[PDB]
Amino acid sequence: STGSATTTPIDSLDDAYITPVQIGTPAQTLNLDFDTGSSDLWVFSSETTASEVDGQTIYTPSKSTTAKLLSGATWSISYGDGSSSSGDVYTDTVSVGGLTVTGQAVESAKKVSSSFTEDSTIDGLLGLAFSTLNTVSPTQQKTFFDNAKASLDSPVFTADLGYHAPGTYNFGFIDTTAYTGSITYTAVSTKQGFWEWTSTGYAVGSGTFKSTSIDGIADTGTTLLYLPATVVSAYWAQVSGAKSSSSVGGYVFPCSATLPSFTFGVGSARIVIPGDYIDFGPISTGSSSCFGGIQSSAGIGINIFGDVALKAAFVVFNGATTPTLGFASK
Numbered sequence: 001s002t003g004s005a006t007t008t009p010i011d012s013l014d015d016a017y018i019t020p021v022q023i024g025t026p027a028q029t030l031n032l033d034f035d036t037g038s039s040d041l042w043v044f045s046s047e048t049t050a051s052e053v054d055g056q057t058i059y060t061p062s063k064s065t066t067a068k069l070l071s072g073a074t075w076s077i078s079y080g081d082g083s084s085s086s087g088d089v090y091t092d093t094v095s096v097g098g099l100t101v102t103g104q105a106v107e108s109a110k111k112v113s114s115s116f117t118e119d120s121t122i123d124g125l126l127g128l129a130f131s132t133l134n135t136v137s138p139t140q141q142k143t144f145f146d147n148a149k150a151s152l153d154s155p156v157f158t159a160d161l162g163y164h165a166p167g168t169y170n171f172g173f174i175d176t177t178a179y180t181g182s183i184t185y186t187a188v189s190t191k192q193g194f195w196e197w198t199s200t201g202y203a204v205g206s207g208t209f210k211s212t213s214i215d216g217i218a219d220t221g222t223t224l225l226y227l228p229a230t231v232v233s234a235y236w237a238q239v240s241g242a243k244s245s246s247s248v249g250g251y252v253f254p255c256s257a258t259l260p261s262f263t264f265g266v267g268s269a270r271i272v273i274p275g276d277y278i279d280f281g282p283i284s285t286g287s288s289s290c291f292g293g294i295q296s297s298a299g300i301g302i303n304i305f306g307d308v309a310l311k312a313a314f315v316v317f318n319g320a321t322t323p324t325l326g327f328a329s330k
Helices: 146-152 229-236
Strands: 002-009 017-023 028-035 041-043 068-078 084-096 099-112 124-128 156-160 168-169 184-187 198-206 210-218 225-227 244-246 251-254 263-265 269-273 277-280 289-292 293-294 303-305 314-318 325-329
Touching: 002 084, 028 041, 041 084, 068 099, 099 146, 184 198, 198 229, 210 225, 229 251, 229 293, 251 293
Parallel strands: 028 124, 041 099, 210 303, 225 293
Antiparallel strands: 002 017, 002 168, 017 028, 017 084, 041 124, 068 084, 084 099, 156 168, 156 314, 184 325, 198 210, 198 263, 225 303, 244 251, 251 289, 263 269, 277 289, 314 325
16 A cells, blocks of 8 residues: 655744545544654543644544544643643544544543644644654554554655655655655664664865764754754854854854855765755844744754755655665655
8 A cells, every 4th residue: 555645844944744644434534744753643532621722623533433542642742842732532534635544542632732723734743753752651552654564665765854844745656756866874773763864974164074973853843944953053153143142042153144055964875955945034014034944953962954944855764674765865
C-alpha cells in the first residue's frame, strides 16, 4: 500500500504545516501537524476542556462506530517550545492520503496549553519520530508510520514541504519526479528516539564550505533551523544590522535586508536554503525589525533541522531495519 497527502502552510510565514487526516467511521477529517520530532497522534476532541477550544475541529469518539476506549491509558506531552497537552486514548481507524491503519492509538486531549488553543488551524499532531518516544501509559503505543510499515510497498515516508506553498507527505514510495539529481542517504541514530543525523558542514551565501560535523534532528514539527552559536553567528555576520536580541528571543535583522543563502552538507552533497526562506517577517505588526529563520541551539541541547532546512529538500525518512535519512535538492 501507499498514501499521499498534501500538506499546507498554516499562515504566510510557513510557521507550520497541516495535513488532512481521516479518523473514525464515518470519517472525521482533522488537520494535523505532522511532526517527525515526536511520536504521539493527539487531537482536539469532544473531551477537550471547552474554554481551551477556539475554532479547532474536534474528534468526537462517540460518533465513530470503530472507536474503542483504550482502558486505563493516559498520555501527557511537553514540547521543546514549552507547549503541552494531555488526555486519554482511543483506538480507531486512521487514514492519511488513502493509506489506512486500523487500531491506531488516537490520543484525545482533555487539556491543551494556550499556544494550542490560540492556533485555530491545528487540530492536533501526528507524530512520526520513533515509537520509543510515545507518551501513552501504562502501555506505550505505536506511531501511524510504525503501524503502517509492514503493509507499505517500501518502509519509508517522504516530506516535501513547500516554501510559501503546499507540499506533500508520501507513505510507502519515493516519487522520483519530485526531486532533482540524486538522493544522498546518511546514517541515523535512533538512540534518542529522533531522526538524528550528522550534517557534514555549511556555507554562508557564496562563501567557502566549512567541513564540520553537526549532529541534529530532522524535525518537521519545528519551524526554524537551530544550529550551534558559532555557525549562526557566522551567518548573521553577513547581514548588515543583524543582531541577537535577548528581548525578542533571537537574531533579528532589518526588514530591508536581502538575506544570503545557507548551505548544509549531507555527505558529499549540498542543500541550499535560499535567503528568502530565512525571513520570518516583522517581530511585531508594523515593525521594521524582522525575525531570523536561523537561530542558535545553545541551551536547547540539540541542533534542529526544522522546516526552514527541510523545505529546501526532498527528504526520505527510511524506516528499514536500520533507518537512514535521504536528502535531495528539488
